[PDB]
Design a protein around this ligand. Structure first.
Ligand SMILES: CCCCCCCCCCCC[N+](C)(C)[O-]
Ligand SMILES: CCCCCCCCCCCC[N+](C)(C)[O-]
Ligand SMILES: CCCCCCCCCCCC[N+](C)(C)[O-]
Ligand SMILES: CCCCCCCCCCCC[N+](C)(C)[O-]
Ligand SMILES: CCCCCCCCCCCC[N+](C)(C)[O-]
Ligand SMILES: CCCCCCCCCCCC[N+](C)(C)[O-]
Ligand SMILES: CCCCCCCCCCCC[N+](C)(C)[O-]
Ligand SMILES: CCCCCCCCCCCC[N+](C)(C)[O-]
Ligand SMILES: CCCCCCCCCCCC[N+](C)(C)[O-]
Ligand SMILES: CCCCCCCCCCCC[N+](C)(C)[O-]
Ligand SMILES: CCCCCCCCCCCC[N+](C)(C)[O-]
Ligand SMILES: CCCCCCCCCCCC[N+](C)(C)[O-]
Ligand SMILES: CCCCCCCCCCCC[N+](C)(C)[O-]
Ligand SMILES: CCCCCCCCCCCC[N+](C)(C)[O-]
Ligand SMILES: CCCCCCCCCCCC[N+](C)(C)[O-]
Ligand SMILES: CCCCCCCCCCCC[N+](C)(C)[O-]
Ligand SMILES: CCCCCCCCCCCC[N+](C)(C)[O-]
Ligand SMILES: CCCCCCCCCCCC[N+](C)(C)[O-]
Ligand SMILES: CCCCCCCCCCCC[N+](C)(C)[O-]
Ligand SMILES: CCCCCCCCCCCC[N+](C)(C)[O-]
Ligand SMILES: CCCCCCCCCCCC[N+](C)(C)[O-]
Ligand SMILES: CCCCCCCCCCCC[N+](C)(C)[O-]
Ligand SMILES: CCCCCCCCCCCC[N+](C)(C)[O-]
Ligand SMILES: CCCCCCCCCCCC[N+](C)(C)[O-]
Ligand SMILES: CCCCCCCCCCCC[N+](C)(C)[O-]
Ligand SMILES: CCCCCCCCCCCC[N+](C)(C)[O-]
Ligand SMILES: CCCCCCCCCCCC[N+](C)(C)[O-]
Ligand SMILES: CCCCCCCCCCCC[N+](C)(C)[O-]
Ligand SMILES: CCCCCCCCCCCC[N+](C)(C)[O-]
Ligand SMILES: CCCCCCCCCCCC[N+](C)(C)[O-]
Ligand SMILES: CCCCCCCCCCCC[N+](C)(C)[O-]
Ligand SMILES: CCCCCCCCCCCC[N+](C)(C)[O-]
Ligand SMILES: CCCCCCCCCCCC[N+](C)(C)[O-]
Ligand SMILES: CCCCCCCCCCCC[N+](C)(C)[O-]
Ligand SMILES: CCCCCCCCCCCC[N+](C)(C)[O-]
Ligand SMILES: CCCCCCCCCCCC[N+](C)(C)[O-]
Ligand SMILES: CCCCCCCCCCCC[N+](C)(C)[O-]
Ligand SMILES: CCCCCCCCCCCC[N+](C)(C)[O-]
Ligand SMILES: [Ca+2]
Ligand SMILES: [Ca+2]
Ligand SMILES: [Ca+2]
Ligand SMILES: [Ca+2]
Ligand SMILES: [Ca+2]
Ligand SMILES: [Ca+2]
Ligand SMILES: [Ca+2]
Ligand SMILES: [Ca+2]
Ligand SMILES: [Ca+2]
Length: 277
């Protein structure tokens, strides 16, 4: 035995500047709770996402997203670790001035291997990969029935204060049922992180470098895919209290170049707390 728990909350913001589809930005509140006992770990989350008009005081089309995940660690050694996560979410949508739409419920099932393997005293290879099935209101939801996503690479530890991580990242959305159509996309990036450790402070500068990316949200009128270049930099800061409440702040800017398109400017901001017990 022994049980250990974490509870926490996050508020985050995502916003393409201009009063576009995300009006004044996407605001996203969430709470989560998790519980671990040796090889088992179980996690609950609730989270909402939708655009906001702050002066009008209004939400646009938004969803909430309750979630359950259980993870089993098959093996954990300094030399090797392999674990597997099952999960499930419901995305409950509430439409606002979308003609012929009110409500929808779409589920998402995921299986995800995860691994860590020691290369030398200082260098490790780690990653996970997830496979997702979306299930119910796909035509009104406009999601694609299937997607894969992975982040995998190398981590070098220089000392107790500095480490570096480079990852390859991929996200692909695609439909295995050819009667669809909706929301296919593909993103590939390299992400690099430079975590820095001093006492109770973690500050980590990071960046994502675009490799290749396309979307086709307008497929019904324009069936060819739109290409993009995105590059992001950000900074994460956290502080441990040491008891074990901890808090964190994060900010990132992203340049969004389109092939057809004037470019966009995107900001992400977030704060969170949690408490381990
Ligand atoms: C569905 C909720 C499950 C109840 C979880 C609450 C248990 C709190 C116990 C705190 C004890 C701290 N402990 C055992 C980790 O040392
Ligand atoms: C209002 C929803 C937020 C609830 C999520 C929990 C936030 C962190 C909990 C605060 C720490 C608890 N405490 C006093 C034992 O440290
Ligand atoms: C540093 C503590 C920050 C606390 C921020 C306040 C949390 C928001 C409370 C949610 C309730 C919103 N409301 C009024 C619609 O019910
Ligand atoms: C102490 C933390 C407070 C700093 C808050 C920084 C504000 C970021 C503004 C992002 C703009 C998007 N917004 C708010 C209009 O949705
Ligand atoms: C300081 C950490 C985060 C503060 C704000 C956290 C808001 C969490 C609220 C839980 C989300 C559920 N709900 C109903 C608001 O969507
Ligand atoms: C993280 C475990 C689940 C706790 C969240 C409560 C279930 C969803 C109910 C909707 C309102 C969420 N709430 C109370 C935080 O605002
Ligand atoms: C000592 C209690 C600490 C509070 C956190 C543990 C409860 C989280 C799990 C309850 C799930 C929330 N619910 C009931 C709305 O589904
Ligand atoms: C659905 C969320 C899963 C969390 C449930 C795990 C709670 C187990 C509580 C047993 C704790 C017994 N104790 C205090 C002696 O450790
Ligand atoms: C989906 C696979 C079935 C597993 C469902 C999740 C339940 C986890 C069991 C927790 C076991 C913890 N323990 C040994 C203290 O009982
Ligand atoms: C994971 C927590 C257990 C299930 C909580 C049920 C909340 C799911 C969302 C339904 C909408 C909630 N509501 C009416 C406050 O918006
Ligand atoms: C049994 C615990 C599982 C927690 C996560 C499951 C949330 C499902 C709630 C969705 C309810 C939507 N509904 C039925 C109102 O349309
Ligand atoms: C998707 C969540 C992971 C569920 C994995 C199922 C648990 C397998 C545990 C079997 C342990 C067998 N063993 C090693 C004791 O012989
Ligand atoms: C909670 C465990 C459930 C795991 C389900 C994982 C689904 C991965 C999606 C790809 C499957 C596509 N499909 C339906 C044609 O087979
Ligand atoms: C390797 C562990 C995988 C977990 C087994 C998959 C069971 C869940 C299958 C998803 C659909 C479940 N259903 C039809 C009852 O809703
Ligand atoms: C890894 C945990 C497995 C999640 C258990 C499933 C909970 C809710 C299932 C609701 C089924 C939804 N629907 C429409 C397919 O019936
Ligand atoms: C799995 C997709 C979510 C990305 C963040 C997860 C970090 C790597 C996976 C760790 C496995 C989960 N667990 C319980 C060991 O923390
Ligand atoms: C794709 C190749 C991955 C790199 C693997 C090569 C790592 C070299 C390990 C050197 C180990 C030295 N030794 C035996 C003393 O430990
Ligand atoms: C993918 C092509 C080469 C990259 C493989 C990973 C790095 C190999 C370095 C392992 C360490 C070798 N040595 C002799 C310094 O220990
Ligand atoms: C997919 C890997 C790309 C090939 C390029 C990697 C070459 C350098 C690998 C890092 C090893 C340097 N070293 C041994 C000190 O850490
Ligand atoms: C982190 C995932 C980001 C990439 C794609 C998100 C899935 C969107 C699929 C189409 C959904 C359209 N809409 C506006 C209803 O969300
Ligand atoms: C250890 C660092 C891992 C980085 C390895 C570099 C990934 C190469 C990506 C291949 C390019 C994909 N494609 C087909 C769009 O060009
Ligand atoms: C050490 C990390 C190296 C990254 C290699 C992992 C798989 C990358 C190749 C995926 C190519 C994607 N695709 C098919 C769209 O080109
Ligand atoms: C995550 C990618 C791996 C980057 C590899 C970093 C190479 C470190 C070489 C440092 C040389 C060691 N030193 C100072 C003793 O000379
Ligand atoms: C390397 C240790 C620190 C890693 C954390 C840095 C990035 C955290 C990303 C937070 C969430 C941003 N996102 C993907 C939701 O938009
Ligand atoms: C948002 C960035 C915040 C910057 C705070 C970083 C300051 C680290 C101070 C290191 C000194 C810690 N100390 C005294 C325990 O050694
Ligand atoms: C290893 C992660 C370090 C975080 C990223 C640091 C920024 C490096 C990229 C150059 C930034 C150029 N500029 C002005 C367009 O931002
Ligand atoms: C901070 C690591 C070095 C990053 C260098 C690549 C940054 C990509 C920014 C736009 C791409 C322009 N290009 C091809 C000249 O790099
Ligand atoms: C530290 C290891 C160095 C790996 C750095 C990864 C950059 C290679 C670029 C991958 C493919 C580039 N391209 C053009 C296919 O997108
Ligand atoms: C921290 C080491 C990472 C090295 C970064 C490698 C940059 C790969 C070049 C990407 C350029 C892709 N493209 C086609 C948009 O120019
Ligand atoms: C560890 C690196 C693995 C090698 C991945 C790089 C494969 C290059 C793929 C070239 C694809 C050309 N294209 C885009 C026309 O298909
Ligand atoms: C909204 C940001 C919350 C950050 C609060 C945490 C600040 C770190 C406290 C600094 C040091 C206190 N100390 C160690 C001198 O006692
Ligand atoms: C400049 C940010 C203000 C910091 C907020 C006040 C909380 C004080 C931090 C408690 C420090 C206790 N500590 C970690 C020395 O043991
Ligand atoms: C960073 C946000 C400010 C939250 C306040 C931080 C609490 C610091 C210490 C918690 C209580 C510690 N205690 C009672 C032993 O001193
Ligand atoms: C913990 C991170 C908090 C620091 C906030 C980041 C400082 C940079 C200010 C945002 C710059 C916006 N931009 C790129 C449009 O100039
Ligand atoms: C508590 C740490 C201090 C918070 C710092 C807040 C400054 C971030 C503002 C970034 C927004 C700049 N802008 C409007 C060009 O995007
Ligand atoms: C740089 C860290 C950012 C932490 C705060 C994230 C939440 C910001 C709250 C959104 C601001 C809304 N507002 C005031 C523009 O209307
Ligand atoms: C530095 C502490 C910041 C705590 C973050 C919680 C503040 C955001 C919650 C209030 C909502 C503000 N908003 C986005 C409606 O303008
Ligand atoms: C925001 C809710 C935070 C509550 C977290 C912890 C409550 C559990 C009590 C700790 C241990 C005391 N006792 C004997 C039950 O173990
Ligand atoms: Ca998001
Ligand atoms: Ca805009
Ligand atoms: Ca906007
Ligand atoms: Ca306004
Ligand atoms: Ca610490
Ligand atoms: Ca198109
Ligand atoms: Ca087009
Ligand atoms: Ca492209
Ligand atoms: Ca352009």
């Amino acid at each position: 035995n022994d049980w250990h728990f974490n509870i926490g909350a996050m508020y985050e913001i995502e916003n393409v500047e201009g009063y576009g589809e995300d009006m004044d930005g996407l605001a996203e509140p969430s709470v989560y709770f998790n519980a671990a006992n040796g090889p088992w770990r179980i996690a609950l989350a609730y989270y909402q996402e939708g655009p906001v008009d702050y002066s009008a005081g209004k939400r646009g089309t938004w969803f909430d997203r309750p979630e359950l995940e259980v993870h089993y660690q098959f093996l954990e050694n300094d030399d090797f670790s392999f674990g597997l996560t099952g999960g499930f979410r419901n995305y409950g949508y509430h439409y606002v001035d979308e003609p012929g739409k009110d409500t929808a419920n779409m589920q998402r099932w995921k299986i995800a291997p995860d691994w860590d393997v020691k290369l030398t005293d200082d260098l490790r290879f780690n990653g996970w990969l997830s496979m997702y099935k979306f299930a119910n209101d796909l035509n009104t939801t406009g999601y694609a029935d299937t997607r894969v996503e992975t982040e995998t690479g190398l981590q070098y530890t220089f000392n107790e204060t500095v480490a570096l991580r480079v990852n390859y990242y991929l996200e692909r959305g695609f439909n295995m049922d050819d009667s669809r159509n909706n929301g296919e996309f593909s993103t590939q990036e390299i992400r690099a992180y430079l975590p820095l450790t001093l006492g109770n402070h973690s500050v980590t500068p990071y960046t994502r470098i675009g490799l290749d990316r396309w979307s086709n949200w307008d497929w019904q009128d324009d069936i060819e895919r739109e290409g993009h270049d995105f590059n992001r930099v950000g900074l994460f800061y956290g502080y441990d209290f040491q008891n074990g409440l901890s808090v964190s702040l994060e900010y990132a800017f992203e340049w969004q170049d389109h092939d057809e398109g004037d470019s966009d400017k995107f900001h992400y901001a977030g704060v969170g707390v949690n408490y381990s017990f």
